[model samples]
Target chain A: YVGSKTKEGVVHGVATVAEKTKEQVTNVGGAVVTGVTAVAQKTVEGAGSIAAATGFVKK
Target chain B: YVGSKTKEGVVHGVATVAEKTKEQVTNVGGAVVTGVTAVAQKTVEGAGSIAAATGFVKK
Candidate 1:
């Protein structure tokens, strides 16, 4: 699920969970966890980068 | 999580864990085991279904 943000929107790197779920949603614990964590980490890192890029005033 | 087939490529019904950690992944003594068994049963059942569409293989 790991994805990167771009002007054209997000581009995903991995397709582990999405595909697995598509095949069968019943037993997908391992796949689901993998996708979510990947996306979340990318998002957080992107946000941090944005903050640094914007350069807000410090108190 | 339980899911019914159809709606284009494995639509998800319930989403339990996609945000837990490995150390936090410690001791899932109940949930993971449940859905997995269901899917496994289905796969085997179908294989038998086609053969019983024949039957009389004495063991």
Candidate 2:
């Protein structure tokens, strides 16, 4: 019916889309943090394992 | 060099990580919007085609 072409409808649509975008960004940000943390922890553990193997650090 | 464990270093690292996360989120958000728009446009076009085929809408 061309109702969505109204200014109010357009504004509402934009706001809704913006909200959805923000939610997605937040979710992705959380995922990125989790990924980074996992990688960092694994790296530290790997380094520690090597150091212990070489007698650089106590096991 | 164990440099990143200092207070200032930790803060800097966090800030850098946060900036990277923000950039990634922005890129992902743009992709999501683009993907959603493409899907919506295709869906609308498909619906129009069906309506026309059924003689519910004039070609």
Candidate 3:
């Protein structure tokens, strides 16, 4: 009864997270996994066949 | 003036590298030469294909 306290709400707010994980912490002691995952596919392709048109240096 | 040089102006910092170069700088192990070079045709094709199929994904 203070500031209209009730289970019912006027507007339901939503927050869309654009991260890979909800609990993925970053900074001092966190894993730094940046860059596009799609590039990994390309790297794999490059590694699979060195003679292929999509050959890449596997270092 | 010693403090003010027209030819040696400090009012600009133009770094208009190619979009591909900017995209390539995600990693810092040093060279990003080949990813940008090798993926040229495929990347261009992929971009065009994506543009054509704009309904599949949102920018």
Model 1: clashing residue pairs?
none
Location of the lowest summed lDDT over 10 successive residues in candidate 2 chain B: B47-56
Per-residue CA lDDT of candidate 1, range B1-59, in tens? 99887543233444344333443343433222222311212342444232222334468
lDDT of each: 0.36, 0.17, 0.21
Instruction: Quote the positional error of residue B37 for candidate 1 in Å.
Output: 9.0
**For model 3, how does the per-residue alpha-carbon lDDT over B1-59 read when each residue is reduced to its tens digit?**
12422221011222222332222223323212222111111221222111010111213
Tens-digit lDDT string for candidate 2 (A8-32): 1011111111222222333321112
Predicted candidate 3 versus true structure: per-residue lDDT over A1-59, tens digit per residue: 13432321121222222332222222232122232111111121222211122122333
In terms of lDDT, the poorest run of 10 residues in model 1 chain A is: A28-37
Model 1 CA deviation exceeding 4 Å by range: A1-8, A13-59, B1-23, B27-38, B42-59
Q: After superposition, how far is residue B39 of candidate 3 from its true place, in Å?
A: 8.9
User: What TM-score quantifies how close candidate 2 is to the native fold?
Assistant: 0.12
Indicate the residue-level lDDT of B20 in model 3: 22
- When 2 and 3 are scored with lDDT, the better candidate is 3
Angstrom error at residue A18, model 2: 14
